[PDB]
Structures are given as structure tokens and as C-alpha cells.
Ligand binder design. Structure first.
Ligand SMILES: C=C[C@@H]1C[C@H](C)C[C@H](C)[C@H]1c1c(O)cc[nH]c1=O
Ligand SMILES: C=C[C@@H]1C[C@H](C)C[C@H](C)[C@H]1c1c(O)cc[nH]c1=O
Lengths: 458, 447
């Protein structure tokens, strides 16, 4: 591919998006804080968007050239993370007013970062379109920075990656690989590289047991796990894997009066999303208890739910105490479970299921991709705006959704030696748990990286 | 700005590059291993290139949207670094044939990385155009990965940042700032967060004293400093700060028969580049000695130089032993020196200079930009401005010296002020920055 070929492809993708926004009288995305944070969910818009990102990243890569890419990368990449580290730890998103500029001098006093160093930090952020300088000596928000205003969940995601995953796990993953090999054992991780055998600590042990800190209303024991739960909510409120996309990948309203068992449902934010939109559903959120869990669980659930979402302490490997429920639901649980642990969980579910009335629903990454929601299946436009070679838009070796999938694949690899699966690996795994399992649906909305898979016992 | 405006701007810049390459019958850049690794040095091509990168990065950012940018960045960014970490530590660049595919199974046996994890590593590399998969189960090089074949300097740059700068310094820079403030003391850095007052360790002390390792022909003491020296060479051999760009920013041949004193010249690769192109110049490389330095210095020195490049041990803060030389040369030295330390070095140079026969030349970042060589839209020159690609590289180096030694980059006015404090006779006669380069060649004289 050449520079001109990529630039020509990019124009094709923009025409699709630009036309849709104009024909529907929808605001254009910009870098202003008032910009829309997402493009429309229309499948053709999203397919064009995903290819546009892929082509645009390739264009910048090709124009930088082979000589400068590795050179520039090792110099700059790590400092985009450190810039977000400064912005989070110094609470700079909240200190910069959303709709009006602020001078470096005033911002320096508000956050307690010396002005000279503050200017250097902000200048790096500008290059990735986080904040801008509208006039000399002044800082203003952009769309990318304004989304984090007043949102501790965004700050949780910054700090969890830069202060935990990266220094403790991903930076030591090479050493972990040469010491233990290609492992699926959560003990074979960074923090245990120099641990005496028997004294290893697991990632989730550190999360729930460390008490030397505080986070967003939780003081002492488990503050890291509470921050981890905040980052789980962060991916539910917006973006690729937003919770409301669940409503588009399964006919929740078709269940009528029904009970859903949310195995491993964190704090129930996902259950809360589906239940608010479906007044006839009951959700039992099953999760391991924590000293702060029950008080926080009930402070944050919307009161209009009238107790339809409730918390039941439960060990996911133990016998399922709710028998014959309409749906047993696991969201991004099994991608942290090797085959033998996942088969244990799936067999616990099968025991409680009525094969003629119960469904098993999982949201997980399907590495080779799920299917679009039926109405989006037929490609009504040009292939250049919906297909990269033989792969669906967003997939393939340089696909943007492929990239996000691998990023999550690496995330569970780093912390617990988990892994993502293909569709055939999922079907094989469920059939090992019980040969009666059959995949009736594998729905992945365009722009989403996770698929909602509905399993039944035939 | 909107998606359509950026895409239209991109077409304008690509047109410049596409036309120049066609009208001069030059090969197009691609991702194939045989691709040209750089675009032509023509200033207009480079200006279009720099704006093109800036416009393309804005386009991908805008298309990702505000909701997904922060969510995706903190998920994937750090794993682009880790992927290169695996590729370097497992020697995968060299194990994949340049012009031939290799299967995952065969590559796994060659590098000792189980095939399943190898596939996961390679798949992430693909998304940033490092390697590709031309057929199921097979790996091939791209242009971005082929540049590192047989090049230990490339691997040194990967390992220096991910195994040293990032875990020891940049990761801890927030903590460093809250413990010591906006400091300029090289002791007030990451590794010393829990050090007792007085027993702090300096970055270059760790570099030259650690012996628990080995790198590229150096075993034991100083292996990290030798690896650091390799990464300094790495930026000379190609790309933005390539050594040959010096030949375009100063009339070296105009010096005639002359001697250059290279203060802080690492291993002399920069001197070797200028001296090979100018047979009438002598270079004295002045640098702090190391047990492995002298043997390594002369083995890597091109024999064609006939000793015109020589090593003289010297403390940059001490009296300059070479009097009245034609040029006193410091490349990316002073950006690691606070004002008072830098003034000390400059005054050492002034003492040895003949004001009527000596020049002082520095290569350093000019944060607001230098001027282009003779021959060569908003308020900023291409590559500069708050989202400029060269601005980004400048800040990255600014952050690099900030992390390791609490250094900082300067604007042109800050440079002039600093030299005049050292000696009021100093005058900036030239501040030449080739387009596509981030460093400027500054020529100082004593009036
Ligand atoms: C906190 C939730 C994040 C959400 C993203 C989507 C995926 C990621 C594996 C997940 C996560 C864990 O599940 C567990 C540990 N560390 C994590 O980062
Ligand atoms: C090793 C040389 C690199 C080259 C790049 C161009 C500039 C960077 C500040 C430099 C560097 C040092 O000078 C010193 C310590 N650590 C570094 O990374």
C-alpha cells in the first residue's frame, strides 16, 4: 500500500460518515469539549469509522517511515502514559474548567504542581489531543479530556494501568515467560518473580487484601479492588463495550417476568442497566463478598429498581443456589478462567438449569468475531466501506477491534495468565462441560469488541 | 475541525509527496521490507510529510472519539511497548528471515518461545505494522521490523527504555515530583524515592558501575552505559537526528585544515560521520574514560580515518587542554546541564578559545524551532505547534532528560540568554535545523 492509496481510502470512509451525519442533522465530531463523544451506532457508520481509524493509523505509520517508527516509539509512547499519570494524580481534569480557559499560573496553584513542570506536562497532552492551549499561557479542555471531568471511574482506569498492571505485571511479563514458560497459572506473574516458593501472592489477593491506601470512598482493605470495580463500571458507561449494547444483542424484553442470575456481576452495574430498561426482570448479582461491598452495593443501585436487583454472596465454583432461573449470565468472566476452571463453572450452571426453560448467556470476546444483529448482516454498500480484505471491518491483523481484543487478551494475560478465545474454542469448551450445549446466537454489535453468546441445553 | 476537513488536508499533503516521488522516479514507501525507510530530504516533501503525520493522527483520534480514546489508550498503549520488549529479548527480528516467511512453529523453536504465546505477541505487533502474517500460520517482516535485523543498536533502544527509563524513572516521576518538587538535582529521581539523604544514586552512576549483566561485547561493569552508548549511535545511523544531517547544517568543508574538539562525544560516532565526509578535519573526542572504552573506541573506529578521530580523556567541567582549536563541539550535551553547570562548561570553552579564530558549535533542541538551511500555515512552521510531530519528539526528549537527570530543553531565547550569562561576548551566528530534524546546529562566536 502507498500513501496516496491510503489517503484515497480514507476519503471513502469519511464520505459515508459525513453523509450520514448531514442527512440526519447530527452534530459533527470535533475536539471541542461540546463535541459528541461517539458516532452513531448505525452499522455502516461504525464499519466506516473502524476502517477510517485503521487507514488513518496506517497513514501516519507509513509517513513516519521505517527509520523513525521504532526510534520515535520508544521515546514517546511511554510518556503518553506518564502524561495521563500526572493529569490523574494531580486531578487536572477537574481543575481545568470545562467551558472556559485557565492560565498555567492559576492551574499551578489549584493542583500544587509547579508552573514550569505543569507546562511541560500539558504540552505533551496537547499532542494527543488531551487539552489544548487556546492562547499563550492558557489551558482549555478538549473532548478527549472533558469526558474525564468529574468522573473518578476514568481516573481509576488511568491509575490502575500505570500504577499496577504496567509496573507490576506487563513490564515483567518477559521475565515471567522465561521463568515459568507459557503459563495459565495466576501464580506465574510479575510480583512473584523473586518470591520464595510458597509465598507467592495472586493479583486478586493483592487487590482485596492491601489496605495501605484509599480510593473513591473506600478506605483501607480492598481499596485497590474497589478501584478495579470502578474501572469495570468505566467500560460500562460508554464506548465500545457500553452496557446498553447488551440491550441490542439479546431480546431481554422477550423474557417477560423472569429472573436473571448474574454470576460474577461485580457491583451489578450491568444488571442495573438491563433491569432499568426491562421492568419485568429480576437480577440476582452473585459475587464474592468484601467488607465494604454490601454498603457500597446498595448506595449506588438506582432506587427506582425497587429491589429487583439484589446481591447474593456466592463462590462461582460452588453449587449454584438459584435453580431453574430463566437466564444465567456471565459477563467477561470466563476469559479469566482456564479450561478446567471454566468447565467447573459451566457445570455448576448446567446443574441448576432447566434444559427446557433456562438459557446461559455470556458476554466475552470472540477473537475471530461474532455476527451482526441480523438487520446489519447484508452489506448494502461498497466493500471498501465495510470490509478489509477477507475480514469484517475492525478485524484482521491491523483491525482496530482486533487491536482492542489483543489489548484485553494481554490484560488478562498480564494479571492472571488468562486468554481470549475464538468462536470454535468457545463451542469446544462448552461442549466439554456438557455435550448438550449449543450456541444459538453470537451477536456482536458493530463497533463493539465483545459478543453476547446465548447457549441452550439441547 | 471535522473528519472531512482533516481528510481533505491529508489529500493536499499526500499530493505533494506523491507528485515528487513520481516526478523523480523514486520508489514509494510501503510496508514491504524492501521499502525505502525514509522519504526524500527535500524540504517541501518533509514539510508535507510532517503535516501529513499530524493530520493523520488527528483523524484517527477524532474517529476513535472522546468516549473510546482514554479507554483504549490505557488498555493498548503499554502493550505496544511490551510487544517490542518480547521481540527484543527473544531476538525475533533476527529469527524472522528478511525476505521469506517463517511458520510460527519454526519461529517458536528458533527463539524458545512457546508457539501459543508467540502468536499472541506477534498479533499485537501486526497492529502497529511490525511484522505481518502473509498466510495462515506464517510470519513475515515489514519495513518497520526489518530495520532492526542485525542491528543491536535498535535492540539497545528498546531495552534501555522498557527495562530502565520506564520502570525506574518515568513510572516514578509523579512520586519524584511530589517528594522533591520541580527539581533540577539529578539525585531527585525515581530510584532514590526511599534513599537516605546523602546516599542517593545517579543515573550515570548506575550506568557505569552496575556489573550484573552484559551487552553487545561488554561483560560486567558498565554494560548498561555501553548499551546506552549503543542507543546514542542508534539515533545517528538514521532518521530524524541522523549524523549526516550535521553535514547539511554547517559548512564543515569550509573550515579547511582544522581540528574539532568533541566535548562529550560518546564513542565518537558523530565525529566519525563528519570526519569521513571531510578529510581535512581532525576530531579530538573528549569523554569520561571507562575500563572498556579505549579498546571499544578504536575497534569501531573506521580504519579509513587514519587516526584523524582520536580519544582524549577529559572532564567536561575541567580546564580545556586544547587551546585555540577551530571548533569546540558539543552535541546534545547541554540539555542535560542546568544553567550553572552548563555555564561552567561554556566558560571552560571560552578560556581555551581564540575569539578571532575559534567557533563554538552545539547541537541541541531549540524548542520553538531553528531556521532551515539556506536553500530550504498557522503561526507555526511545519512539524511545530501544540500538535506538531517534531514538537512531540522534542517533548519526548525533554521528558527523557527530565526523567533520568531532571534536565530540560530550551527555546532559542533561553539558549542565547544562557550563553550571554556565561560570556557577554557570545553571539548566535547561526541556528540551522533541517526540516524533519528535531535538533538545531547552533554556531556561537565571541565578538
Ligand atoms: C477492571 C476491568 C477491566 C475491564 C477491561 C474491559 C478488561 C480487563 C481485563 C478488566 C480487568 C479485569 O477484569 C481484571 C483485572 N484487571 C483488569 O483490568
Ligand atoms: C542515549 C541517548 C539518548 C538519545 C536520545 C536521542 C536523547 C536521549 C536524551 C539520550 C539519553 C541520554 O542522553 C541520556 C540518558 N538517557 C537517554 O536516553
Amino acid at each position: 500500500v502507498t500513501l496516496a492509496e491510503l489517503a484515497s481510502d480514507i476519503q471513502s470512509q469519511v464520505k459515508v460518515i459525513d453523509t450520514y451525519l448531514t442527512e440526519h442533522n447530527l452534530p459533527q465530531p470535533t475536539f471541542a469539549p461540546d463535541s459528541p463523544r461517539e458516532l452513531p451506532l448505525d452499522a455502516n457508520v461504525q464499519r466506516a469509522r473502524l476502517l477510517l481509524i485503521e487507514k488513518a493509523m496506517a497513514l501516519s505509520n507509513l509517513a513516519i517511515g521505517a527509520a523513525d517508527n521504532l526510534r520515535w516509539h520508544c521515546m514517546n509512547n511511554k510518556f503518553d502514559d506518564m502524561t495521563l499519570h500526572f493529569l490523574a494524580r494531580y486531578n487536572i481534569f477537574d481543575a481545568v474548567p470545562r467551558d472556559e480557559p485557565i492560565s498555567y499560573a492559576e492551574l499551578s496553584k489549584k493542583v500544587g504542581l509547579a508552573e514550569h513542570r505543569l507546562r511541560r506536562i500539558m504540552s505533551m497532552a496537547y499532542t494527543q489531543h488531551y487539552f489544548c492551549t487556546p492562547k499563550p499561557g492558557f489551558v482549555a479542555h478538549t473532548s478527549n479530556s472533558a469526558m474525564a471531568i468529574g468522573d473518578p471511574l476514568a481516573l481509576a482506569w488511568i491509575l490502575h494501568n500505570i500504577e499496577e498492571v504496567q509496573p507490576w505485571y506487563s513490564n515483567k511479563l518477559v521475565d515471567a515467560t522465561m521463568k515459568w514458560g507459557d503459563s495459565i497459572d495466576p501464580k506465574h506473574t510479575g510480583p512473584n518473580l523473586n518470591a520464595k516458593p510458597g509465598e507467592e501472592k495472586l493479583f486478586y489477593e493483592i487487590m482485596e487484601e492491601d489496605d495501605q491506601g484509599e480510593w473513591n470512598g473506600v478506605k483501607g482493605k480492598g481499596f485497590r479492588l474497589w478501584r478495579l470495580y470502578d474501572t469495570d463500571k468505566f467500560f460500562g458507561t460508554g464506548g465500545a463495550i457500553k452496557g446498553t449494547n447488551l440491550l441490542r444483542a439479546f431480546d431481554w424484553g422477550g423474557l417477560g417476568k423472569a429472573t436473571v442470575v448474574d454470576i460474577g456481576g461485580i457491583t451489578g452495574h450491568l444488571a442495573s442497566t438491563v433491569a432499568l430498561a426491562n421492568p419485568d426482570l429480576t437480577f440476582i448479582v452473585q459475587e464474592r463478598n468484601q467488607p465494604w461491598y454490601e454498603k457500597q452495593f446498595y448506595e449506588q443501585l438506582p432506587a427506582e429498581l425497587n429491589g429487583r436487583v439484589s446481591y447474593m454472596p456466592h463462590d462461582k465454583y460452588a453449587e449454584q443456589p438459584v435453580k431453574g432461573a430463566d437466564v444465567y449470565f456471565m459477563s467477561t468472566v470466563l476469559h479469566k478462567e482456564p479450561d478446567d476452571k471454566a468447565i467447573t463453572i459451566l457445570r455448576r450452571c448446567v446443574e441448576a438449569m432447566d434444559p427446557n426453560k433456562s438459557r446461559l448467556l455470556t458476554r466475552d470476546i470472540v477473537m475471530d468475531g461474532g455476527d451482526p444483529p441480523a438487520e446489519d448482516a447484508v452489506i448494502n454498500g461498497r466493500a471498501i466501506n465495510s470490509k478489509e480484505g477477507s475480514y469484517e471491518a475492525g478485524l484482521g491483523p491491523t483491525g482496530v477491534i482486533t487491536r482492542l481484543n489483543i489489548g484485553i487478551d494481554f490484560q488478562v494475560l498480564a494479571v492472571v495468565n488468562g486468554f481470549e478465545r475464538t468462536r470454535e474454542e468457545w463451542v469446544t469448551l462448552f461442549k466439554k462441560a456438557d455435550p448438550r450445549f449449543a450456541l444459538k446466537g453470537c451477536i456482536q454489535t458493530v463497533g463493539n469488541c465483545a459478543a453476547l453468546m446465548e447457549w441452550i441445553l439441547e
